[model samples]
Target: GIFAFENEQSSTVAPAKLYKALTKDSDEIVPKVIEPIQSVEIVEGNGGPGTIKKIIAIHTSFVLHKLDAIDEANLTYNYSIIGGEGLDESLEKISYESKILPGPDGGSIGKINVKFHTKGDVLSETVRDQFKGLGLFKAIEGYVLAHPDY
Candidate 1:
């Protein structure tokens, strides 16, 4: 095990829908759901464990993310940021683990944990804070919970 920063969040999104969103839909549907992310492009793979994505967000011009694992049966996804145009030396690596499960009352409970492997722990507070502030974790559950037909 590695000693790194971690963050956890819970959301009431259906496991089925959440799995799809985190796996394939996020590339196409996310930018539509969140205005800040104007678009997402799959730079490699067809959308799976080895897939790489290029996202053009509002604040950051582009972010390069690579999917490390995609578990459909478990409704889990994991990824890491390897490089991007705005990358700084302070940030060595950023990774995330997200899981969605069945919740009581037909709601889904989801948790997303973030890990930081910064260079000498020099990553800025804002960069780390944005993960929680972006509202992406909770926001996804909101939409998935709303659109049962989704």
Candidate 2:
């Protein structure tokens, strides 16, 4: 079974900058600010589509993610969770597609669609919240705000 959801958030950052920070330069910045992320490294490919990223989180939990698409010119990014720490017998994998759009205030609007692939009909509320990715965005926002030139 597959359960999916979409979410959008408004931010006071430009679309280009936000997209770059989230996709291209994520390796350099994410681990430092996102509390749960301890380290992020490219395990395969050259940081583009088909690239597999290994992200280590708190308590040594990690995830293997494959970049399905990275449209820098369009500010769109897509990735799939092939395997990871929260995955179990009831779960298959998770996929996400995100886009950064220019806002009326010269800021940005982030839109994300999440698809949860499951082996059975099971999804705890906590499980869903953990993959929302909103926390990571908030942390990055904090970092960008503090580092005005970033």
Candidate 3:
């Protein structure tokens, strides 16, 4: 069975603003805010669907993510794993879907869902906790909410 889960995070930032911070300024802000992440580089494409991005982080680790969808107007994005140095350790594949929507309070909410296919019957806690532990979605949300000039 594939391990799958969904999570929703609320952000005080505007929908459009959070979308830009998550997409356009991602490469610039990720490493700065996320301690282990060193850099994010687009291996291919020009910020659109089918784009491939490689992220270099701690432990000489890197992942190549292929963008499946990017809708600027809708404030949604999706991506799937194609290759990554960290993939082989315990995961077969992983996919993510994310969106930022208008909140009732004139702010925005960011939601992300992830599915992890494992190499064994059960996924290790480490593998499963990566995303939750990193808290990237909320981190970006907090950053955007705090910085209005973005």
Candidate 4:
């Protein structure tokens, strides 16, 4: 079995606004805040189920991933890399879910949970550990905070 690791990050944002931004194609808004992302292009189905996208980072690094819409009523979605150039072949799968829930103060708490599964080996384990500990959550949290208006 492959080893797995999970990481989560949360932020408070108005549900109405976050819902709009999360549902819209990142191709239209992500680059505005995450400057490292050069562009995001929709490759498959329209923003619903089976939606595949190619996200190109600013430095020419890119990932071809698919988005699976989940629990729309709660404004949640799952993402994973289906194909990519830099991704490790032994990295069996990687997935992440974004969920938004009502907060006590009328705002909403947005949470992102990422799960990574890789071949059980020293190299894979090292990479996985590094990814989870290297401020990935903080980077994502910062991005969300910067785009609260979306």
Listed in order, each prediction's TM-score against the native is 0.77, 0.85, 0.81, 0.72
lDDT of 2 by residue, 19-43 (tens): 8788877777888886688888898
Cα lDDT listed for each candidate:
0.69, 0.80, 0.78, 0.63
Candidate 2 residue pairs in backbone clash: none
Rank the candidate models, highest TM-score first.
Answer: 2, 3, 1, 4
**How many steric overlaps are in each model, in order?**
0, 0, 0, 0
Candidate 4 C-alpha lDDT tens digits along 1-150: 444344443456566565556666356666665678788888778767788888888648777878766666777777776667545677766666667677767666766666665655544644654553214335444555685544
Name the lDDT of candidate 3: 0.78
Off by over 4 Å in 4: 2-6, 120-123, 131-144, 147-150
Better structure of 1 and 3 per TM-score? 3
In candidate 2, residue 74 scores what lDDT? 91
lDDT of 3 by residue, 1-150 (tens): 478778887777779888888888887888877778889888899878988889888958887878889888889988777677656477777777888889977888777877787878988978855754226677776777777675
Q: Could you tell me which 10 consecutive residues in candidate 1 have the lowest summed lDDT?
A: 1-10
Q: Which candidate ranks first by TM-score, i.e. highest?
A: 2
RMSD per model, one decimal: 3.2, 2.2, 2.6, 3.4
User: What range of 10 consecutive residues in model 3 has the weakest lDDT sum?
Assistant: 128-137
Q: For residues 16-130, what per-residue lDDT tens digits would candidate 1 score against the true structure? A: 8677866767776678677788888888987878888898987468888899998888888888877875455567656778777788765566666677666673557656545
Q: Alpha-carbon error at 2 in model 1, in Å?
A: 5.9
Best by lDDT: 2
